[PDB]
Design a protein around this nucleic acid. Structure first.
Lengths: 78, 47
RNA sequence: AAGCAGUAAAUGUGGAGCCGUAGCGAAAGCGAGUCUGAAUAGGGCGUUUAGUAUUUGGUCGUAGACCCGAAACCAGGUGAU
RNA sequence: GAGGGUAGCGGAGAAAUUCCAAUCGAACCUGGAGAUAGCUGGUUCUCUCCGAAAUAGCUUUAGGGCUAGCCUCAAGUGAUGAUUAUUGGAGGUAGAGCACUGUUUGGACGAGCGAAUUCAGACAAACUCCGAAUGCCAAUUAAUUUAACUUGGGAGUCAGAACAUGGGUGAUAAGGUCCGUGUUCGAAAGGGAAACAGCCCAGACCACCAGCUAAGGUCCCAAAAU
RNA sequence: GCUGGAAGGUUAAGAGGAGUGGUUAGCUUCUGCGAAGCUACGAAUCGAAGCCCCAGUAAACGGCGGCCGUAACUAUAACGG
RNA sequence: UGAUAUUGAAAUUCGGCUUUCUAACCCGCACCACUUAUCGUGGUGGGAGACAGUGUCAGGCGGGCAGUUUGACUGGGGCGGUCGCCUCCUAAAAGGUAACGGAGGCGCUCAAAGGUUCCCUCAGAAUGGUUGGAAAUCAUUCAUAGAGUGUAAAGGCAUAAGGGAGCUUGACUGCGAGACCUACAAGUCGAGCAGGGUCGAAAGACGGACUUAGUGAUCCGGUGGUUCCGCAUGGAAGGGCCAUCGCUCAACGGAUAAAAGCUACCCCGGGGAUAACAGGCUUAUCUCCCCCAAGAGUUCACAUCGACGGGGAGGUUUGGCACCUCGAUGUCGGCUCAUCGCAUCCUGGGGCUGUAGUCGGUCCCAAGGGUUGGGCUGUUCGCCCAUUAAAGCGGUA
RNA sequence: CUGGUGACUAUAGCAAGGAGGUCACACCUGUUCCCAUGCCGAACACAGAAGUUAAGCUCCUUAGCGUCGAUGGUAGUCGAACUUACGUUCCGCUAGAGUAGAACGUUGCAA
């Protein structure tokens, strides 16, 4: 016979590009996502597609936005 | 149907723009107010 | 370099020419600074600013290019014992 | 029978692709010519150090290439490399569960009531109120060790195989086929499994009629306990 | 496919030269007008065959069908839609 | 087939058509001479005549002939199907990960369905009244999402990204530290600086749409602009730069502007990297042998038969895989010659019986010997005729 | 101890029973004015005689629901040895139960 399946799309590479407690620069990407899985905290912005980037230089900390919610922040340490 | 259109400045130097427009929804020519680089001021664009 | 002299000889003459000493820009052009740009405001490429002639070795290009091997194509001739 | 004619991009054929000097889907000789061959075959002396790959992307591409990965030589920078010990973190697999979407068993509930309401009991790669062991990213933190990075010269490789483990497909078939993660072979000789590339132990610089061990073994072949 | 016909439509080279642009003797608001020569590109109109079109030709190339009911025939249909 | 040159001379209505004439040109037409030759040439008579034939340019027909094209993946090839992009599962809680594995979409749309400032909260259920689905509208209560978000899916959103209203065009210009992905070419996000602005009292927000698909290198050509160049000189033709347009190039990193088939007349270079026969692994299929017992058998499951279900042996059939052989392992039936196994056709030996006797059915041990001749068909196979104690089943390329 | 405004997973909640008002938060009256309605002074905005704790709001009690949650065991699994389902060593779930729990807690007014 034949088949009707077999199609796919190129795999987009999301996830966390920076580790907790790691020094970052002023434009580093912290997280790539669809929708909102991690909220922006202090000194963290949002792009066209929902992506998190740092605004200043410092460490990266993943915090808790209450119940079942999450955020990441950048603190100007040294 | 959609037709690609261009906007030309009026009574001044031309600072062109490109947009899209539906043939039936806007059968006439649209006019807008856009920044002009030559005149360094906002002006009216037609066509 | 060609040429001239010299033993087909290795040596003199010959400074047309070539590379380097300063880059940027499509170009006009400017110049340790140029282009884009209304604006060194930012950005790109530069400020190393030590090369050059010959030769041993490795690799590449043009020539068949490590060697042997076709089925085929074109041109000019020889054949009805 | 003798003398003659028709010549190859051509002749002749009562027609078979039949014949034109033992050869004809297009004769023979010499030149272009050492045509072209991403294809088979072959490639000549000796020692020392190091030592792969059978992968991704694209391809009128699939047994051919190019860039990247992995190997080697030289010149440079100088803890930037690997393993553990202690914290922080992202990410929903095994398992379990029915609070969502679907499936389903038996009783009370008339609006036919094993599901429009309620109490117990089950199922799921494309279900989740929950959630490990490992693995992964960092600290600029401590002991041990020896590597990592950059610029230049030269390559090879793009047919992989078995075993253990998590899966798809097949029929919870295949020495079947396609993926992830390890070992060995490839390119590894020595000992054990009777013989037996991939299984178990173990990595050969050369010489000795010296000792202790591993895997497997100690009645005879056959070294070791009848 | 072959043959016969030209009422209409399409159609080349070649004739045809309405017009456009470049140059400048001169004039002039100063970056425009602009005669004649030389030069580049050209429009209306005319131009055959062929094709579309009309007819014939099959010992030319070719092609020659289904569904549904019914006895003066049990089944089955001379016949009907 | 038409225009034009060789190509002349006169007349008719509106640059010409048509009809006349002879000198150009033509005659494989007659007579004469070179010449005992009509090949050739010349002369004299007839015929046709600016026609034909020839030269240059243009349109049409033209496998008669010539040079080439006719894709890849593929559990061999052909046939069928597919080729670029997006969203899930397989995918083994970082990222990545294949198969002709399992499911769906895309080649858009919106002038408000964009920006800003204010205001608001859904679906569903019950009851009541001119009863159409107590859900076509009027009203009340419960109701954290089951509703909506333009279009598939996933991830999100009730601080709304969901619904309403006012104003407006940021669906701007020149950029851009740093970062993700990555062979390259490409793709993604981005704080901030300057020049104009919209909404808002203001802080502020705004470089299209809740996010992720809606797209095609280069070459060449068209349009608008420009301190650029422009072959002695001033112009111009022609280029450069900036903006934009024209490709189901969908075989979607795109051979060329332009391309289909047969070969049983076939040839060359390679491959067991890849099929057809036999060997090898497996046993779906095939042939046998068992487990339980609903029943049939007048009664009575097991003399004999054995429904619904379950577990094995063998390697004789049809298949699956593609491990040896393509610088060669030669097929189907028949003849000659055999050999091995027992799951036994006859003969020898026993148990049970629904075994009165002669005959029968079923099971157990047993491989010593034996196991027919013809008609049809190339046949293996099968049917038929006549016998026999019997006319057995398989392996050995 | 009442009010204003910020910080932590409902140990902060839902629900039921009680106590309180003229300082404050509320209720309520009215639509000339600053404003508005698919129509609707119901709501948004104003000027404010009265009157009541009914309801919002503050405090107390209730373990009915919801939330948090030990120890022990079990499932699964890193690594090792036999072998193919069983030992040895670490980590350690869901579910179900003993249980915290009717909130702690910063800062300027007021009594």
């Amino acid at each position: 016979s034949s088949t009707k399946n077999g199609r796919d799309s190129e795999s987009k590479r999301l996830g966390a590009k920076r580790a907790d407690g790691q020094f970052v620069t002023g434009g580093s990407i912290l997280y790539r996502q669809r929708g909102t899985k991690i909220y922006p905290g202090e000194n963290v912005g949002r792009g066209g597609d929902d992506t998190l980037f740092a605004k200043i230089d410092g460490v990266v900390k993943f915090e808790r936005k209450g119940r079942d919610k999450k955020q990441v922040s950048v603190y100007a340490v040294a | 149907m959609r037709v690609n259109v261009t906007l030309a400045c009026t009574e001044c130097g031309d600072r062109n723009y490109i947009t899209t427009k539906n043939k039936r929804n806007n059968p006439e020519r649209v006019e807008m107010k856009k920044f002009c680089s030559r005149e360094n001021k906002q002006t009216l664009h037609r066509e």
